[PDB]
Design a protein around this ligand. Structure first.
Ligand SMILES: O=CCCCC[C@@H]1SC[C@@H]2NC(=O)N[C@@H]21
Lengths: 566, 254, 51, 103, 51
């Protein structure tokens, strides 16, 4: 009918239905939300600074961070003493090591935030980081995993949060075939929590297991020995394609200098006990002997160069690309996010978020009239086709079917998946249970777990209960996890668990007010005591923590990380 | 100049026909000769031929490498000249991209066309500026620098300058729903308890705003209807409603 | 066919035709209002194949 | 444009004269419905400036002999049209069911 | 240019990477009387090169 184009015009124009046009009006509601978000990011963006240069914050105005006041002078004294030795006490080794003008990720940050409670009731162990810093680094045109042991040995070298971080880094590198670089500085072991860190599985032995399984798959790895690595820490220099020992302060020992005493205590110099022995000794241990920190870093870079990965990365990830920005300003991402601590769940939207994040502000909807709860479709993220699952409302059987169908197509055509978690939302109606809802949930989870597609999840907010099993979860092998500040990970019910557990707990009929004070308030305190900031990341649950505004850049880092894969 | 209409045609008209070469013109000289002026050359059916051809070629490989079976090619362009749509049809006979014909306003002829270097692959707002040559059968030849875009085709040559607007064909391609929407709209589940309705009755709803918000165990679950037309409310805030109740009728604006 | 075997005849829409009313059936990926819209969505789906 | 040849000078083809008015009536009724009765769906679907093949053509040319001795079944095509098409930079097979349901 | 491995140790034998007209190469050039440690270094270099 008076309409005869050739699909384009209708396409390739600034007027295709594919795009999205949710324009906000900045009203009170927007302000209430936008403002809060701002109230939810300032310190997130801040604590980072405090742990960075940990314990030395000369401004002394860090009231925006709820961190307790710490003895700045002690940390400055320790740093001065350490830097007088001739080694750089910072993450400086990293940004010296990575090529200028390139990107970085800082995979796990704020690790071990106020984790352990000391004997002093008001004092926690001052683990500003997990004892290491981990991030994806691009060296000499080669993408690599960077792990650096911090010089914080006051509490002890490695904790249940340190070895877990190291093992997570090793698993990520092995999955993605990114070579690792380890910067080694250790105080040995922790002889206090040794039962928690040495024996059992997924412990310090699995590091040695991984450093051999990698070299089986011919994924070369490199370690730099800046200081002592004793107590089983001396095997990494031994198990290494290339290793670096600094001329003066680089030391490697299987038995400590105190250990020779009380067992043939003919004590001699710490150099002769296994440290950097530049005298043409009989031992052929340690590939590189470098006179200075810069010399060692330079030789590490030079060894990284001769791996032939530059051609493969350059072919797989195009270095010269034209950035395509979204149609709407990314600062608006905080506004559509609702507020917090609201008796009844507030309202929420997804279209706006996806239209703000994706390229050209576009989307490819599958069936949206049907199973209106769940959202699935294709997209574009900086030159790469992506699939997104974002959740909105209370799940039905049909939503699970649609999810299974989408995941089937994505696995069929080798399209990566992105997850945006939300509430559990399993209806409890009797008719729904009689309609085989459990079978359809199984249909969804089977497809989720069976998918060989790379998978990344990011918390939008309100991910509580067994609903994440429908979409995705840490136990379903997501190659990366990141989080927004307004996140709560809890039991099958965030608010309802309060009501349900109020009924069935040794409660007399009378004393109703005192009981709800003792029951409902207490369970609310329990189920929102956990949050994005503490229960997560600090314990390497969903290790990555980010800002809602800069999500697309992070996801693009992740996707470039997962295309060197076999 | 190409890109914006100018009064340059007016000034030339002010200089040719008015006999002001004598030198006597009054302050109100412009007022009386307004009928004579404001006149421009008539777009001949040939001008459409070069203008139409440029838009294709200056956009793609139309007529380039084209091939069918036991038939011949055909491609058409629609021009929105003045307030009347204009259709031009171009086709070829033989194995010749060179030999081309045309039929606009029931006028038919033949010509050949030889292009120039291909430029502006990015085809941005400026699009492609290329020189063209056209050998019509009668015997003439022409040279035309055409900067063509989706909005219009501009041709500059010995004829002058002419921009031909392309017939616009856009209208919410997708969301074209004329459904009545009589009943059973934004129905709420059993618990009901509607409240906090933020939409005025009898106001157009094309974008999917929250028409009604119903709460089922702290489930705001906003309906977010996208049916176009004004929405008429049959319920009030705070009124508990049954399952799948007709909370409102979203009907086309009549 | 419904007639002569429980011939409670109803509209051809309800018998399996295009049922744009958010029915329980998740049958048919795309519901397009016009021929051009359907052809355009077919083209758009063809695009996302990586070939 | 099977069975509708307005030139009526198709003597170069030995095809028997057919009722053009009936086919035009059917096509008018079908196009009034809102769907394009032609192969038009195809050339709308394929990118402009590209090629096409029309794999099988003249399919079912005067194949079946009807009860009427001088009449064959009017299958102008095989009921479908098949050709190789290049869509959005992707080569694809195109099969279109013709609206000829009279037989 | 050259990319020396351990040269202070097993000073007899020479092994390292290089560049020959746009292609990365490994060179083993011998200098002196071989020791056990020179043999170990050679084995390690050949291991990396095969890897
Ligand atoms: O409309 C009423 C049904 C409410 C369903 C609430 C869902 S069921 C599973 C999940 N756990 C809760 O406590 N609430 C949600």
């Amino acid at each position: 009918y008076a309409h005869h184009p050739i699909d384009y015009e209708r396409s390739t124009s600034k007027s295709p239905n594919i795009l999205r046009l949710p324009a906000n009006t900045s009203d009170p509601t927007y302000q209430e939300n936008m403002a809060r978000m701002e109230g939810l990011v300032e310190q997130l963006r801040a604590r980072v600074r405090y742990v960075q240069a940990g314990g030395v914050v000369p401004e002394e105005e860090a009231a925006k961070a709820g961190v307790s006041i710490s003895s700045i002078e002690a940390d400055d004294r320790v740093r001065k003493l350490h830097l007088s030795r001739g080694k750089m006490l910072a993450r400086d080794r990293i940004e010296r090591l990575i090529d200028p003008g390139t990107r970085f990720l800082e995979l796990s940050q704020l690790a071990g935030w106020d984790l352990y409670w000391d004997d002093k009731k008001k004092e926690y162990e001052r683990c500003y980081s997990g004892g290491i810093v981990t991030g994806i680094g691009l060296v000499n045109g080669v993408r690599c995993m960077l792990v650096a042991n911090d010089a914080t040995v006051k509490g002890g070298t490695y904790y249940p949060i340190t070895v877990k971080k190291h093992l997570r880094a090793q698993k990520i590198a092995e999955q993605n075939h990114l070579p690792c670089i380890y910067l080694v500085d250790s105080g040995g072991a922790n002889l206090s929590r040794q039962d928690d860190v040495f024996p059992d599985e997924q412990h310090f032995g699995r590091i040695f297991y991984n450093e051999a399984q990698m070299s089986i798959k011919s994924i070369s790895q490199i370690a730099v020995v800046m200081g002592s690595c004793t107590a089983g820490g001396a095997y990494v220099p031994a198990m290494a394609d290339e290793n670096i020992i600094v001329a003066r302060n680089g030391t490697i020992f299987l038995g400590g200098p105190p250990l020779v005493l009380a067992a043939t205590g003919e004590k001699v110099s710490s150099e002769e006990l296994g440290g950097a022995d530049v005298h043409c000794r009989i031992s052929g241990v340690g590939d590189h002997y470098a006179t200075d920190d810069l010399h060692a870093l330079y030789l590490a870079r030079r060894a990284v160069a001769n791996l032939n990965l530059k051609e493969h990365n350059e072919a797989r990830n195009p270095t010269d690309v034209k950035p395509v920005p979204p149609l709407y300003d990314p600062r608006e991402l905080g506004g559509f996010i609702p507020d917090m601590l609201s008796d009844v769940v507030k309202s929420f939207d997804v279209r706006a978020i996806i239209a703000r994040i994706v390229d050209g502000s576009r989307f490819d909807e599958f069936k949206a009239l049907y199973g209106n709860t769940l959202v699935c479709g294709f997209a574009r993220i900086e030159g790469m086709q992506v699939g997104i699952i974002a959740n909105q409302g209370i799940l039905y059987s049909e939503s699970a079917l649609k999810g299974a169908h989408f995941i089937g197509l994505c696995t069929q055509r080798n399209v990566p998946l992105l997850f945006l978690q939300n509430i559990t939302g399993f209806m409890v109606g009797k008719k729904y249970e009689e309609g085989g809802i459990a079978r359809n949930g199984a249909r969804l989870v089977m497809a989720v777990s069976s998918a060989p597609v790379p998978k990344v999840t990011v918390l939008i907010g309100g991910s509580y209960g067994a609903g994440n099993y429908g979409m995705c979860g840490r136990a379903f092998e997501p190659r990366f996890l990141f989080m927004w500040p307004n996140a709560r990970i809890s039991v099958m019910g965030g608010t309802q668990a309060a009501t349900v557990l109020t009924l069935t707990n040794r409660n007399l009929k009378n004393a109703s007010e005192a009981e709800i004070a003792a029951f409902k308030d207490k369970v609310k305190k329990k189920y929102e005591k956990e949050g994005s900031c503490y229960y997560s990341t600090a314990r390497l649950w969903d290790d990555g923590v980010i800002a809602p505004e800069d999500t697309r850049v992070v996801v693009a880092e992740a996707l470039r990380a997962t295309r060197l894969a076999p | 100049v190409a890109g914006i209409n100018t009064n340059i045609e007016f000034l030339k008209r002010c200089c040719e026909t008015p006999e002001f070469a004598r030198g006597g013109v009054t302050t109100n000289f412009i007022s009386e000769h307004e009928s004579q002026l404001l006149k421009s050359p008539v777009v001949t059916p040939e001008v459409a031929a070069m203008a139409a051809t440029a838009w294709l070629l200056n956009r793609c490989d139309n007529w380039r490498g084209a091939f069918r079976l036991n038939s011949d090619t055909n491609a058409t362009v629609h021009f929105y000249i003045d307030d009347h749509p204009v259709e031009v049809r171009l086709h070829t006979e033989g194995a010749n991209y060179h030999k081309i014909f045309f039929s606009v306003w029931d006028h038919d002829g033949s010509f050949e066309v030889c292009s120039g270097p291909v430029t502006s692959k990015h085809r941005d707002q400026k699009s492609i500026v290329n020189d063209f040559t056209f050998l019509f059968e009668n015997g003439m030849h022409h040279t035309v620098l055409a900067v063509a875009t989706e909005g219009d085709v501009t041709v500059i040559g010995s004829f002058g300058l002419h921009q031909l607007r392309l017939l616009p064909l856009t209208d919410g391609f997708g969301d074209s729903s004329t459904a009545g929407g009589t009943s059973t709209k934004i129905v709420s589940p059993m618990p009901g308890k509607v409240s906090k309705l933020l939409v005025k009755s009898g106001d157009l709803v094309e974008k999917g705003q929250v028409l009604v918000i119903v709460e089922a165990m702290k489930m705001e679950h906003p309906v977010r209807a996208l049916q176009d037309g004004r929405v008429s409310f049959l319920v009030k805030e705070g009124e508990v409603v049954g399952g799948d109740h007709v909370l409102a009728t979203v009907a086309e604006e009549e």
